[PDB]
Every structure is written in structure tokens, then in C-alpha cells.
Nucleic acid binder design. Sequence first.
DNA 1: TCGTGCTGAGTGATATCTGCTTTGGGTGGGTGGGTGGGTTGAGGCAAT
DNA 2: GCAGATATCACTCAGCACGA
Lengths: 82, 137, 92, 124
Amino acid sequence: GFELSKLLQKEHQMRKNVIKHTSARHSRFGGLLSIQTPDKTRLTVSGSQALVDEKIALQKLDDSKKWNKRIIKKHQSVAAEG
Amino acid sequence: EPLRIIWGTNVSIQECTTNFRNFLMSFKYKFRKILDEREEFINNTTDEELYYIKQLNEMRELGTSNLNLDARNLLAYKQTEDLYHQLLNYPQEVISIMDQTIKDCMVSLIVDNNLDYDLDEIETKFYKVRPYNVGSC
Amino acid sequence: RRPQVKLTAEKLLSDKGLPYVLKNAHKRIRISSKKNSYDNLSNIIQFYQLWAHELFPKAKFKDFMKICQTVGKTDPVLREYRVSLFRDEMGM
Amino acid sequence: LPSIQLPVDYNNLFNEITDFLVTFKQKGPKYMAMLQKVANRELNSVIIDLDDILQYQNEKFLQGTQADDLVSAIQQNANHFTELFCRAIDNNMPLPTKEIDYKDDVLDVILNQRRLRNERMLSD
DNA sequence: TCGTGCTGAGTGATATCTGCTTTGGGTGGGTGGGTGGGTTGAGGCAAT
DNA sequence: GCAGATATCACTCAGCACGA
């Protein structure tokens, strides 16, 4: 019981931290932000939460990028070597 | 220092947030009466009190996440005259900013007042504003 | 049919890039004792990510840093300039 | 797509239309004033009276400088002359005289930013 | 102590391919058209 | 002629071992 309570308290903290990134309104509410960089150019970032916090806006701009660099992980199972 | 700006316009979001926070922090209903040419109807108890502070405190005591707003109240104040037009013309961004500012105001009220209220309930609650009386029908 | 865009030494050495960083990097970035360490790290990463996006929108921040590491390891002309900046300071 | 030799020239008709909007006089030219009102955001509908076109054509012919029959061209194919008239109005549009708001103009901030970005990119 | 040519591996863009109807029903229409088809029977309620 | 789901081929990149 004590361990379950501790784990539930940890999960509650994680949920609270996640809630900070979610919008109060629904997905299709709308709202576009235009963040201008110092060299007189503005990039458009969507989402309600990006309007108030700049870090979230930059993070979402980062995630929107599609291209991913390669990562090759050649691993051999133990059964291969018996 | 990148500057956040609403798309297609020239309104700084930080200006909106600070103006709305100031309006909520210090607003007395006497301004609303003054605006409507009802100066002689001003009392000394209800009109000399921080309206939205009592609204937010009642919200907290009753455990609610809703604050009904009147646009004519925004027009009454001095710093939020342009905020009325911004709300009318760009409702989505202004509404989101107002919701976040309301949540921040509640958190700041709890922290500064040194109350024993646990921060968990307020932190995980979504707060929404519901403006009405926004002009002619 | 079309060669892939790639972070070559030519792009890095252009007016935008390393010259841009040397021009304005200390003015924008500022680590303050009063502010928490997280905020200072966020500011530094904020500057560098903006610069990378302006220069190389193709790759994300971590991928950009890894590509920069590889290029610095490989390209000799980049090494020439990198040594040169240090040499000027020794002169100063 | 085999081609035919139709007896209609669009360059000459466009020139005639451009002259019509700057010379007709039913006060200065009627349509110049109408456009001036539009540029002040006071009017949002320009109505071209084919009677005016006929009057202008007959006035030109009386002087001896006969031109193409614009009225018959407009009725025979009207979907094309809308574009011609719009292009002529855009070309001959006057600058506003009454101070405009320019405050809540989404397609003015968008265009200003688009011009700034294009100029900065091309210049570099 | 280390630099570079060869290799397997995996995406990116592009080649062929199937499909382009589909469907029973009146808040999908009849300028979408019948060679795409739709063929009740009891029970309740207003009028009288 | 047109959009979508699918499979094919070709090109380029990070690791590896050896020789300098």
C-alpha cells in the first residue's frame, strides 16, 4: 500500500507537469502566433500554449521539422552467440 | 529577445497579458458606473472593492474554473481600451491569453497571500473565460 | 536526380554562420547569477537554435550539433579557420 | 490545338477600355471620380453603363477617329471583359486622398512583411 | 601514435498499379440520370 | 485526366580494417 501510494504520488506529479503543456480549449479552437527573430523575420507557430511561453513555441517549431539524421544500431542477440 | 506577435497584426502578446493582469488585479465597479453616465449612483461599499479579486476568491472557495467577463467592464478601465477591440477582432488569441492570465492570477493570489490551500488542485485545473455583452446583437 | 542539401564548410564559412556568431554572440547571450541555471541554459540554447534555424532549417537542434561535430572532425578548411581565430587571440 | 484567326484584337480593345475610363465625361471624368471614391473605401461596387460606352464610341466616330465596336464585343463575350476592366482599373487606380485607417488590415501587414522578406532575400 | 578507400545498409523518389464508386434513401437532389436501382401492412389519430 | 495506395531501384552515408 505504501509503495502504491508513493508511485501514485509520482504519477500525479508527472500528470501535473504534462497538464502545463495542454491547451484549455479544444484542438480546433485555432490561434496562430508569429514570433519575430532579431533579423526582422517572423515564423508562424500554431497552438494556444505557444502564445504565452516562448520556450514552448521554440520547442514546437523544433518538433515540426521532419528530417531526422541516421542512427544505426547493430546489436546481436545472445542466441546468435549461443 | 524574440517578440511574440499575433499573426497578421502588430499587437504584442506580452502587452495584452500585462494589461489584462493589471485590469483583473485593480478594477472597481465604480468605473463601470462612471462610463455609463451613472456617477450619482456610486455607493461606498460594493463600488470601492476589487471586483475580480472577489470573483476569483469565490471561484477558489467553490472550486470552479469559470469567470464570466463583461466587455463593457474592459471599456471602463483605462489600460484595456485597445484590448476590447483586440478581443472583438482576434477572439481566439485574446481568449487564450485571457485564460492563461486568469490561471496565473489565481496562482499568484494563492502564493502571495500565503494561504494554506494546496497548489495541486489549482495547478491541474483548466481555467476558461466566458466574455459576454460584447456589443449589439 | 537532385543532390541533398548538406552542412558543408562553404555554408558555415559564409557571412551567415560562424562570422554571424562571432559578430553577435556575447551581446544576445547573458548568464546571470540572479537567474536560475535553467533560464541561462534556455537562453543559450535559444540563441543557438535560432542561429541554426536561420542557417540550417533542414536539421533539428541535436542533429545540427551532431552534424557540426562530424564536419569539424572532417573538414580541413574549417580546422584552418578554427585555429586562426585562436591564433589571433594569442596575438592580442 | 489547331488555331483560328478570329477578327478580334484584345490589345486594341484593352487600350480603348483604358482610354474610356480616363476620358469619358457624362466635374472631372465620371469613372475617375468613381474609382477615387473606391480608393477611399467609400464605394465597393463599380457599375459600367454600356450606354456610356456607346456614347463614347459615337463621340469618337463623329470626330472621325473611328475605333472598334466595344459594346458588341462586351455582349458577345462578357466573361473576358470583366478581367480587362478590372486590370484597367488596377492600372489606372488613383492614390487615396482621405486618410485610411490601416490598423486592422490583415492583408496589409501580410503584404508588408512579404515585401520586406523578399527585398531582404533578393538583396542578399 | 593515426588517415582513407571499400563495403552493406537503408531511405527517397519514383515506377507501375488499382481505382475512379457507392449507395439505399428523401436534410444528398432532379441542370447527374433510369441500361445503377427502389413493387408493405398494421396501428394510431384527425375529421367527422 | 485525376487522387491514393503500393512496391521498386538507385544513390549516398557511417563503420571497418588495413597501411602510412
